[PDB]
Amino acid sequence: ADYQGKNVVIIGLGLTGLSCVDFFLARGVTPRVMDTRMTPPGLDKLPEAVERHTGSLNDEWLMAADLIVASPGIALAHPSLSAAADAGIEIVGDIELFCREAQAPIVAITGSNGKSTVTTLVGEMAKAAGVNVGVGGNIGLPALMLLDDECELYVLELSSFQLETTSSLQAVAATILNVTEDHMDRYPFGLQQYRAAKLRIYENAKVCVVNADDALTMPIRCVSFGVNMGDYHLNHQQGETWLRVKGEKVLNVKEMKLSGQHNYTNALAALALADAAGLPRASSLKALTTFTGLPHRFEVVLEHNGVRWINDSKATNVGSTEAALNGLHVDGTLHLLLGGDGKSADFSPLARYLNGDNVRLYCFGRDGAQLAALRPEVAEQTETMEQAMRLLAPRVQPGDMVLLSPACASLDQFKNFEQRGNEFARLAKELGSH
Ligand SMILES: O=C(O)CC[C@@H](NC(=O)c1cccc(COc2cccc(/C=C3\SC(=O)NC3=O)c2)c1)C(=O)O
Ligand SMILES: O=S([O-])[O-]
Ligand SMILES: [Cl-]
């Protein structure tokens, strides 16, 4: 693409907005930036020469633009954007800009849960093969910060939002790992509208990798992964699990540092993508044995005095919390922290995990009351996570687990789920020893 001479408007500041500003400036185009937030992140990192408008969208700038580059954080359905679209003004996002420039194959990964783990794993598989790989997107670096002529493979985590504004992705291998209710505040046509955004990832993909156990991952000729069925699947052997490809054992999961069924299916999905991307199977298996997991993903931050304190702050939806609780072994009592901005999700699916004598709920943030209602008799509600932690800590006994898996976004009270996880870990360390 050639942007020279164009009037470009970027919506949204932050690292990704900034990567877009830098992209255009390095191409001799000075964009203008707007953000509906009165005081957006990275405003101070914006070069003085770049005009900016904050606290609202500026329709004068939008309607004057030749190209609008929309952050995944602004809805396409916003009246100002739909006005511009009606006028025939082109709207893209950062991922679209990246796809138009990239000079190496792209592995593209989306899904309601598992996408950062799978993205990171495939990156590690590439590194193990000695491939120069750029890994990022919706995690790590914004994708435009990865662009480099020496890169031989890109591995991108993509959100449903990023996919809505992308039209030129031709992935070497693409997956939707699963589709469970999330972001309903952004999808007023519900689950199928959210799914449709993710289904975009398969358009013009050379290989599609689908989840044999989740029909919503299938296009409306794909490689599949699954538990009991699929091209890539698991083979259980007397309290032993193997990864298999078409009947052939490829890895006994005792060699993995990750544990749990959903991590085994993440490993299958990663291997399927890596195979389709032409990475040697041997090095890809090696990467599976060395990968330790991501911060905030069911992460043990303290195991002391008979209590495990687990930071699963990356559980920002119900399906993710369900994955933490399903099959969970606890010797004593589970003290479960739930809370934040539930994005209008139905929390009901969690209730089946919350029966019996050995569960307590501590519920906080915007939707704390709705969360406590899952089982009022074992629930406490506080305003903040810190209040909840200080409430539960006196009650913790040897054998117990304290689990932050909040089923909600952190954004009502925190900068992001990492800040929430970091605060939890600090408080766990304070409260979890003498
Ligand atoms: O970290 C958490 O706790 C939750 C993360 C959680 N993320 C989002 O909902 C999300 C969806 C799309 C994009 C992003 C990245 O986050 C951004 C980046 C730039 C601007 C904005 C907000 C903008 S831009 C504007 O013009 N007006 C705004 O309010 C938000 C975040 C979620 O999954 O629930
Ligand atoms: O720019 S991103 O980090 O919101
Ligand atoms: Cl506005």
Side-chain angles (χ1 to χ4, degrees):
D2 191 347
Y3 302 109
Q4 200 184 327
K6 291 316 158 84
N7 188 321
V8 177
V9 167
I10 293 164
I11 309 171
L13 218 48
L15 194 58
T16 300
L18 288 169
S19 77
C20 291
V21 172
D22 295 348
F23 178 86
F24 285 102
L25 285 173
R27 284 161 185 67
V29 174
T30 309
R32 296 193 283 184
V33 175
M34 71 185 51
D35 191 307
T36 68
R37 294 170 286 191
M38 304 255 175
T39 181
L43 182 59
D44 276 61
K45 322 296 233 163
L46 191 68
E48 217 202 331
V50 176
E51 298 174 49
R52 77 292 306 270
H53 173 102
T54 57
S56 56
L57 302 182
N58 181 325
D59 289 326
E60 288 176 357
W61 290 10
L62 290 172
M63 293 307 289
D66 296 315
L67 179 67
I68 297 164
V69 183
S71 168
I74 191 82
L76 283 180
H78 186 293
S80 289
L81 274 183
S82 73
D86 287 346
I89 301 168
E90 188 176 13
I91 301 167
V92 306
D94 78 312
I95 300 302
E96 174 62 17
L97 297 177
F98 174 86
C99 288
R100 291 167 175 196
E101 306 303 325
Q103 298 296 322
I106 300 167
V107 175
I109 298 148
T110 192
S112 309
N113 193 34
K115 60 185 179 290
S116 303
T117 298
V118 175
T119 298
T120 305
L121 274 175
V122 175
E124 296 303 304
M125 294 173 173
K127 284 178 189 185
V131 169
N132 186 317
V133 62
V135 185
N138 188 59
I139 57 163
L141 307 180
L144 294 170
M145 303 186 67
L146 302 175
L147 274 177
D148 166 26
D149 279 353
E150 298 161 45
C151 187
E152 300 169 311
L153 181 67
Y154 290 106
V155 182
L156 302 179
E157 181 185 325
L158 301 183
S159 65
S160 67
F161 304 139
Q162 288 168 317
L163 284 162
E164 293 181 54
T165 57
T166 305
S167 57
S168 306
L169 173 67
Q170 312 192 20
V172 74
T175 191
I176 309 173
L177 298 175
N178 47 63
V179 177
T180 67
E181 182 185 58
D182 196 3
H183 304 303
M184 290 289 107
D185 59 335
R186 277 280 295 268
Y187 293 108
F189 302 75
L191 191 70
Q192 292 309 310
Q193 187 190 20
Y194 172 47
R195 180 196 177 201
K198 294 190 178 307
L199 289 169
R200 300 176 65 78
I201 202 168
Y202 295 136
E203 287 175 30
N204 304 125
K206 183 189 166 193
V207 174
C208 42
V209 171
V210 307
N211 182 346
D213 296 317
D214 184 346
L216 294 195
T217 70
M218 285 145 206
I220 293 278
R221 91 311 235 226
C222 297
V223 177
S224 66
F225 69 92
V227 169
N228 299 311
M229 52 181 162
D231 299 313
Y232 294 71
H233 61 268
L234 305 179
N235 179 38
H236 305 276
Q237 295 286 357
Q238 329 100 50
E240 274 208 320
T241 302
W242 290 79
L243 309 185
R244 304 213 306 190
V245 184
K246 289 155 180 299
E248 183 177 328
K249 282 179 172 64
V250 301
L251 189 69
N252 182 326
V253 303
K254 75 175 182 177
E255 300 296 318
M256 283 177 62
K257 304 181 183 160
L258 299 184
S259 301
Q261 196 178 76
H262 67 104
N263 278 327
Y264 307 150
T265 59
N266 286 342
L268 296 174
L271 188 67
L273 293 165
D275 284 349
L279 297 178
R281 171 75 63 68
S283 33
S284 296
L285 294 168
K286 175 65 179 162
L288 287 173
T289 67
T290 61
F291 181 68
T292 54
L294 292 174
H296 321 284
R297 272 81 176 176
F298 210 87
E299 178 185 11
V300 178
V301 297
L302 181 69
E303 180 162 10
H304 191 247
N305 287 341
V307 184
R308 289 174 286 167
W309 303 72
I310 296 175
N311 168 12
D312 197 32
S313 181
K314 192 38 161 85
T316 53
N317 60 43
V318 165
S320 188
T321 297
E322 182 155 11
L325 303 177
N326 186 47
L328 175 63
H329 177 75
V330 184
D331 294 300
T333 302
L334 176 64
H335 305 273
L336 177 58
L337 287 122
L338 299 172
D341 178 359
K343 291 166 282 177
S344 300
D346 181 7
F347 296 121
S348 293
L350 298 182
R352 69 178 282 232
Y353 297 107
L354 304 184
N355 297 319
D357 284 6
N358 304 118
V359 177
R360 300 295 184 281
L361 311 178
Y362 307 84
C363 299
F364 63 94
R366 177 178 301 166
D367 293 336
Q370 300 171 53
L371 288 157
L374 292 173
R375 190 171 171 203
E377 330 90 62
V378 305
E380 300 256 32
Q381 182 191 348
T382 56
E383 182 186 339
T384 69
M385 186 182 73
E386 179 171 0
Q387 291 163 346
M389 283 291 276
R390 297 190 185 284
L391 186 62
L392 69 91
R395 318 191 169 153
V396 174
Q397 304 291 351
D400 291 2
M401 172 179 297
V402 179
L403 172 61
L404 170 65
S405 190
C408 298
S410 66
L411 302 182
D412 60 312
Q413 299 171 312
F414 299 90
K415 197 178 172 177
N416 48 45
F417 73 86
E418 290 99 332
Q419 190 185 64
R420 177 172 69 189
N422 289 334
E423 168 172 323
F424 170 83
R426 185 184 35 83
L427 287 164
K429 294 156 178 311
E430 183 203 332
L431 297 166
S433 70
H434 298 112

Short mmCIF file of all heavy atoms in Angstrom, two decimals, residues 36 56-57 78, ligand 3:
data_model
loop_
_atom_site.label_atom_id
_atom_site.label_comp_id
_atom_site.label_asym_id
_atom_site.label_seq_id
_atom_site.Cartn_x
_atom_site.Cartn_y
_atom_site.Cartn_z
N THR A 36 -11.42 8.81 22.71
CA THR A 36 -12.62 9.32 23.40
C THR A 36 -12.38 9.51 24.88
O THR A 36 -13.19 10.14 25.56
CB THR A 36 -13.86 8.42 23.24
OG1 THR A 36 -13.66 7.20 23.95
CG2 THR A 36 -14.13 8.12 21.79
N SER A 56 -13.37 12.76 23.15
CA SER A 56 -14.49 12.45 22.25
C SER A 56 -13.89 12.09 20.90
O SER A 56 -12.69 12.27 20.68
CB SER A 56 -15.44 13.65 22.08
OG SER A 56 -14.76 14.81 21.61
N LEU A 57 -14.72 11.60 19.98
CA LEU A 57 -14.31 11.56 18.59
C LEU A 57 -14.61 12.92 17.93
O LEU A 57 -15.59 13.60 18.28
CB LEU A 57 -14.96 10.39 17.83
CG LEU A 57 -14.69 9.00 18.44
CD1 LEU A 57 -15.33 7.89 17.63
CD2 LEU A 57 -13.17 8.75 18.60
N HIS A 78 -19.82 2.42 16.47
CA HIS A 78 -19.92 3.76 17.02
C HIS A 78 -20.51 4.66 15.91
O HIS A 78 -20.07 4.57 14.77
CB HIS A 78 -18.54 4.28 17.43
CG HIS A 78 -18.55 5.60 18.12
ND1 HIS A 78 -18.91 6.78 17.49
CD2 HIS A 78 -18.20 5.95 19.38
CE1 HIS A 78 -18.80 7.78 18.33
NE2 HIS A 78 -18.36 7.31 19.49
CL CL B 3 -17.55 10.89 20.72
#
